[PDB]
């Protein structure tokens with residue numbers, strides 16, 4: 465209710481500690497803060513964790529109470545609900561380890577709970593489908609910025625972080641600062657009266673640009689007709705993590721035919737983005753999907769391999785690399801992708817029977833799931849409607865670089881593992897190039913043999929943050 469003034473009180477902070485690399489890290493915690501006045505789901509609370517020094521007038525890693533970066537990680541995966549995280553949390557999902565390391569680094573951490581596609585209200589109604597995830601992230605950001613000074617840390621140094629769907633969340637927050645599209649939703653929640661633009665973005669394998677991901681997936685994997693992914697088994701770990709196991713399949717003749725069309729359409733989509741290299745050349749693909757853009761993907765994988773090679777890693781785990789002397793001189797991309805293996809079938813994102821996480825994400829209070837591409841709606845195997853075009857646009861980070869309607873974070877660090885096949889490499893690469901093209905700071909790479917995952921390079925992430933903030 466409006467009795468919730470959304471005013472943070474440092475008096476709420478209580479002392480705790482956690483071991484990191486065999487040493488005690490002292491911090492203060494305040495949990496379960498209702499960050500909007502009119503929440504519709506119990507998950508909509510946030511936790512605040514502060515390096516202990518900041519409650520005693522001292523410094524950590526060059527930062528003080530007033531100047532410390534504010535890291536805002538999320539636990540969103542598969543566009544499911546992401547509970548408020550905690551350095552003490554052991555239940556799945558969690559990035560507790562990252563919070564612990566962040567505190568050691570001197571960052572204030574504000575970990576918000578975020579609704580997801582399965583979130584229902586007290587009456588069992590669905591209230592977490594798009595764009596709930598990003599509304600909640602923005603509401604938490606507004607809570608933080610509204611409470612500048614009261615909350616330890618610099619509210620002008622908010623850095624979001626997340627993996628996969630959570631990476632898309634982080635990227636979207638960075639791209640869509642103060643967009644008018646979300647104002648109605650935020651007003652309805654009674655979010656704090658403040659801005660929601662942020663300082664920097666960290667994103668691991670952001671699963672985004674969903675309405676073009678099917679074309680990108682087939683551009684990449686056409687010609688590879690076996691797929692290998694996971695399905696759930698009964699039971700969880702003691703900490704609630706769902707159990708999985710490998711299951712393979714083979715594309716049908718019909719899927720193979722559909723793949724070829726999706727692949728062909730990608731060339732036009734890609735070309736019409738008008739992406740450029742550093743020297744300014746238009747990056748493109750021809751009718752058969754070859755060209756300068758394809759060469760960029762290849763080069764990024766060669767760079768990834770060289771970095772691993774120099775560390776003594778055997779890059780011939782995967783096929784296609786040409787090593788001359790101690791230099792990775794070339795790559796047969798098709799061969800690499802074949803050894804890497806296709807994970808998803810066709811279409812990979814907009815499934816014709818509405819069964820994908822993305823389909824459910826684009827459902828609403830009436831329909832459990834929707835299509836979000838013309839192709840899938842046309843080819844639908846079940847009764848279905850297309851999601852609202854503006855909504856699709858609104859939750860795509862790219863939209864804010866290509867049609868200005870927001871304030872964009874100046875600093876971006878994006879990673880997508882060289883072994884990650886949840887989405888085509890073209891997807892994060894398009895984001896990175898578009899960022900660079902529009903003058904934003906972008907640190908991008910495809911780390912060698914890293915699977916679908918995040919937070920695996922914390923030393924480097926934190927050095928990047930410190931480079932921006934100290």
Ligand SMILES: O=C(O)c1cc(O)c(O)c(O)c1
Pocket residue numbers: 540541542543627628629630671821822886887
């Ligand atoms: O958050 C994830 O792990 C995730 C989310 C997705 O929407 C998705 O299509 C995927 O392959 C992985």
